[PDB]
Design a protein around this ligand. Structure first.
Ligand code: PAC
Ligand code: PAC
Lengths: 14, 575, 168, 575, 168, 15
């Protein structure tokens, strides 16, 4: 597993 | 979104005052539509629904007024599944095989050349919720021969939300409003504040549907992938779905399986105020911080608040101290109507002087090896009133600057939970080079836009209706505005136009009080009621909002029929 | 029985629906929402029914931002068909008080009345009134939209990811 | 992109005429930059380079003028790798394991808060070229334990391209131009057309760097994945990379390994004209079609040509036939300058009357069960001149309509290779309902834009410079324009603005001839030379383009020094 | 041993560079292109060096469309560093005639001369002249850009796909 | 392999 490939999602509704 | 509930210590009257200010979509089907529903003997309620919803979600009736803001409490989690040998669409539960439920779905799809063809996929549910492709989150998270991932939203099984708003639409007191909230425990992803006729106390709660996991489970149930991706999904439980011991828990007072029980969800009643501007429940009232609620609700004393939260509580305290420039020291409807549009900019109020003192002498700089003349930027910002009112001059230069300032190592006085409105603070003198780089960029961007550094904000920030650019005020939360009018348009593309699909902004606004003669509500629907440019209601409310002229919305029968624009018609049909 | 609602409009066009029962209040509210916002609403019913691609192309994005964000039509269609399935709609409806089911049936009928009016003529909703995707809806469709709003904190944020989950 | 080379029989002068018209970017680093380079005893050349390129890519000198258009010939292929199992970073070649070559790369990345994070990935090469993630093309095409994919671009090993344009910049005849093109076989992804001083015939070629595969290889070497996606990637070899007999071939007259030999790549010389508008080599001249070249160059009779290709050859034939409304029947420099901006619309010229005859009686329709009033659309289109000139009225209604017409079974005269300009044609009466649907939508979209249905095109289609909207003419290739000015902006968002990042459009244009006194070139650089809004060269050329005023660009020393705007300065420094 | 170029400009600003050798011709041409288009070019050399993300953030798209399209900076940077490696640049340059090597050296020097002038002052390129990414470049960087233009038909179209190829 | 899962890339340079 590589943190240099994590893409955070949008999580705040609105 | 912002809201306040002021109780009778703050209003000095026999009832409180509610300010509802969701920051939300200006276009699209989630946008608000303002209306009143009068159902003989059953309900008389006024407020807004999303388009396509049939009951009022934010509004008031003769007895209670309420509003919502999105809550920091996470509403979903993931379950990592351990796959049955040779059958990647089955998973193990405590070592026993369970088949995922397939659905083969065919969607007709129009092509480039205008023909229609079928697209077919077979998709899956687990007992937790649908399967979810997490490879986009990180490639190691693919559905393999050994592992898959499902997502559980506790609202997937919460069929109580519409009926809770319906019951609130009919509620006859703040007490009943609260009892309904607790009995249904259904509010799906928002905080709630409410005020009631005849009640001293305003109400704040994050009581609704929330996944229930224990600290012991978080420590033992989080898989290695769950650990590795956890920083991207803060407080989201990412658990081993092959162990029944990792299933979300049910309390004795849980209304719904796998949800937090009613007594473990935060609420607070105050006679002075409650407020929320999207940080967690912690500082519903700064004088009485809430702590000790489940981790999933968010931090309570260990994270700095946003600049908008710092600004919104500062505004409440200064109203009640009588130190904000408005009349007296009570949060009455008339003063609250002016206060919430005042477009103060926290970052400038707190840090502009320190910034200019650090960087503006001399105002001729060397920035990345380039000569930069900052004298006019320094002089414009020094003269500026630290507000985003329509006539404020230079406020857009501040937006283009502050939004670029590196916040790592910006402040020398860190967050303190014992001073949460005034920390962090202290602009770091070591940041001077970085602040000059940000200011040089901001000067360059305002330059490319065509606006003068000292242009009035109303010419930069606007909504066009009927061909006229109606000047606006307010700005983006990132600068510590409370009054939100936050364009998604780059300044260099025609300014901060609100005409496209702006970021979440002031939308339905209500200030609601309960004088003796009956509930009174002043409102805006900033983008106007109708999305059709031909309608007279595509731009009339927007012209009132530009002017700051709140609508007194009629509510009693006499008020409706006595309104200067009153028209009526009957629609009827079989069934 | 007859739906019958009185529509009173005041300054800014704010409608005050008066009706003797919940079905009739829903009829008046569905009507006025369509009367003022038909184009946004008719487009939205394609989203919740999983029918965007048929009319607008699978590869085009959602027209409007919302709690769903703007994924591609094809992915959105699959998401809504899979998650807002007929069972999910059945389960949602089976949990409701009679008055709310009656309200949502009135709401569909009031929206459809306005659709008939737009198809017949008039200067309103010129942008979409003659398009195929302006069309009557059912009470179940309104329930799909109602359930969709519940999902904003969870499933809505992973619509494309849910639409594309497939075994190796 | 379009280009023509007219020979001396066509011009009736002692020299041919070269028209270069790349459709290309209006912003960014691949945009064109016009200049002349005069290097003592070595070269004297004028034309354009991409920003950051040091030699002239499309241009002329005292002896030859030339241009390029993107070619249909594929320049890349994929290799499906069979992996050594348990070691998915190795692959088999004729049964022997081969390690992929790894590169661990660290990229620094600025964060929201100003800090910089290093991002690290290990990426791989095969002997074919880099590994490539094809899961986006189809999820079955993931790099698994068993299979990966590599992409090979013939130009990754072609180090000859810049040197080829350098030699062309220096060339002293078309014969030499031709010999260089053949010797280098380096042109990477474009066709070429050239005219030379003292040559009767104009030159066309798609002679450059192209993968070499045989029909027997395509049959033997295409893997089952390759066949299943082959229609998404037409003519791209998708081969089994585990077999050395599936490597790209080399001919005895190949200049580069794996590339097509010089004698097997298409070219043509003609006394009358050659031209290309982005279809394959097939119709370099419609009187003398080219056939029989390798499949990878594109079809030569199985496929209908685009409406723009049909328009471009129609314009050449009608000029030489003297039936296009300009004087005489020769493609002189003066007449070419006018003809290429004339903005004829092939789809309207050929199909508008048939569409109107079929659907405008009656002009009140029922479409999707709705009343639609088409009387104004029908009347405006009937009156329209079928051009996108600045003053043409209703041309943008046609754009919104034609672009929405479904093409299946639209025509009753199918494509015929014996007449690829006039087929397909003949609007099918059975399409009436679909055509009314497309027109109803067009009408609604123009309505939503705020333009009248009969607005003049220069109000709809424009480039803003200095705050003024300069009216433009021309249009999108999909409608059968030859004169290309093709906005990416939806009409409903302020019309066909060219101010953003438009679709490939008229950019550098040159009409070049070789009278006895010396080469003469008339040019445009439509977006102007400089990207700096403060420069007098950000909008001057665009004002000329809007006006239709070709620039006679000075070339000899006397022309340069005698130019009304001439300035000189010398820059020097130690090497 | 000095670069020296005579720059003549005519109507519409078209520059006519006159020089005694190829290195000096490159010197005048790099200078005039930068003088007229510094902000586009300076941004571009971040692209070809794979240094966009350092300055502009990894999740932002390329500013300008081009043959590369507009992938995210982080993927563009991986693509350029992997495909336009120092090895690819060595092989490209090793194949070139001396006159072109000299021309490109001169072009980098001319571009650099203009960067010095823009950093020193002036009303030109106000949009970017004080940015960190307005900076001198090398002849290797110009070969990076030259090699990049070659790949439009092949590798450029799969920039993100090449940047994201990883074994399971 | 599902043909309908295929998404063709953009192969025309400049297009
Ligand atoms: O609450 C918010 O901040 C946004 C919102 C939208 C709809 C209903 C409640 C809240
Ligand atoms: O040929 C084209 O159509 C576009 C283009 C041509 C030549 C060189 C670069 C780009």
């Amino acid at each position: 597993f590589e943190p240099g490939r994590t893409r955070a999602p949008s999580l705040q509704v609105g | 979104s912002n809201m306040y509930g002021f109780g009778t210590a703050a209003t000095g009257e026999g009832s409180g005052v509610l300010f509802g200010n969701p920051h939300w979509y200006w276009k699209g089907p989630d946008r608000f539509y303002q209306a009143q529903l009068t159902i003989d003997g059953e309900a008389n309620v006024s407020g807004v629904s999303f388009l396509g919803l049939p009951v009022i979600q934010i509004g008031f009736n003769d007895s209670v007024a309420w509003s919502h803001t999105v809550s920091t409490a996470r509403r979903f989690g993931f379950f990592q599944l351990s796959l049955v040998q040779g059958e990647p669409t089955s998973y193990l539960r405590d070592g026993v095989p369970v088949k995922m439920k397939p659905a083969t779905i065919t969607v007709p799809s129009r092509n480039a050349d205008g023909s229609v063809s079928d697209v077919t996929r077979t998709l899956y549910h687990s007992e937790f919720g649908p399967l979810v492709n997490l490879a986009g989150l990180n490639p190691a998270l693919a559905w393999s021969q050994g592992t898959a991932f499902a997502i559980r939203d506790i609202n997937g099984e919460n069929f109580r939300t519409l009926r809770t708003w319906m019951r609130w639409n009919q509620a006859k007191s703040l007490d009943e409003f609260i009892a309904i909230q607790k009995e249904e425990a259904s509010i799906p992803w928002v905080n709630t504040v409410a005020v009631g006729r005849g009640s001293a106390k305003a109400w704040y709660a994050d009581i609704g549907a929330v996944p229930n996991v224990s600290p012991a489970q978080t420590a033992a149930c989080t898989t290695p992938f769950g650990m590795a991706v956890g920083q991207a999904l803060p407080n989201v439980p990412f658990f081993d779905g092959s162990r029944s011991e990792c299933d979300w828990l049910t309390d004795a007072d849980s209304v719904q399986k796998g949800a937090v029980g009613v007594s473990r969800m935060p609420s607070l009643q105050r006679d002075d105020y409650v407020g929320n501007m999207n940080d967690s429940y912690w500082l519903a009232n700064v004088h009485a911080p809430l702590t000790g609620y489940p981790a999933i609700f968010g931090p309570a004393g260990t994270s700095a608040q946003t600049l908008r939260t710092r600004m919104g509580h500062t505004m409440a305290l200064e109203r009640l101290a009588g130190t904000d420039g408005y009349a007296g020291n009570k949060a009455t409807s008339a003063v609250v109507r002016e206060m919430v549009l005042g477009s103060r900019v926290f970052s400038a109020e707190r840090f502009k002087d320190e910034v200019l003192d650090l960087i503006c002498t001399p105002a001729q700089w060397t920035v990345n090896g380039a000569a930069v003349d900052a004298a006019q930027a320094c002089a414009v910002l020094a003269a500026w009133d630290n507000r985003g009112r329509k006539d404020s001059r230079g406020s857009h230069l501040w937006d283009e600057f502050w939004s670029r300032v590196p916040t790592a190592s910006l402040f020398t006085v860190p967050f303190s939970a014992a001073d949460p409105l005034n920390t962090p603070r202290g602009i770091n003198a070591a940041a001077a080079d970085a602040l000059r780089q940000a200011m040089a960029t901001a000067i360059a961007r305002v330059g490319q836009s065509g606006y003068a550094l000292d242009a009035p904000r109303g010419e930069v920030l606007y909504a066009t209706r009927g061909g006229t650019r109606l000047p606006l005020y307010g700005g983006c939360g990132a600068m510590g505005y409370f009054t939100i009018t936050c364009s998604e348009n780059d300044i260099t593309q025609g300014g901060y136009s609100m005409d496209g699909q702006p970021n979440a902004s002031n939308s339905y606004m209500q200030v609601v009080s309960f004088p003796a003669s009956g509930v009174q509500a002043h409102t805006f629907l900033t983008f106007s009621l109708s999305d059709d440019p031909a309608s007279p209601h595509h731009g009339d409310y927007t012209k009132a909002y530009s002017a700051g002229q709140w609508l007194r919305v009629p509510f009693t029968e006499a008020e409706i029929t006595g309104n200067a624009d009153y028209r009526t018609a009957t629609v009827k049909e079989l069934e | 029985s007859t739906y019958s609602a009185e529509i009173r409009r005041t300054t800014m066009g704010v409608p005050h629906i008066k009706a003797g029962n919940w079905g009739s209040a829903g009829y008046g509210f569905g009507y006025v929402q369509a009367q003022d916002n038909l184009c946004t609403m008719a487009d939205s019913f394609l989203t919740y029914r999983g029918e965007r691609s048929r009319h607008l192309g699978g590869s085009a994005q959602l027209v409007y931002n919302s709690t769903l964000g703007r994924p591609r039509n094809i992915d959105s269609d699959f998401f809504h068909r899979h998650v807002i399935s007929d069972e999910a709609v059945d389960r949602t409806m089976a949990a409701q008080p009679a008055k709310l089911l009656q309200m949502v049936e009135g709401f569909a009928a009031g929206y459809n009345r306005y659709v008939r009016e737009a198809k017949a003529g008039g200067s309103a909703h010129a942008a979409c009134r003659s398009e195929a995707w302006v069309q009557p809806i059912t009470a179940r469709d309104v329930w799909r939209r109602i359930y969709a709003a519940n999902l904003a904190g969870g499933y809505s944020n992973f619509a494309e990811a849910i639409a594309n989950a497939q075994p190796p």
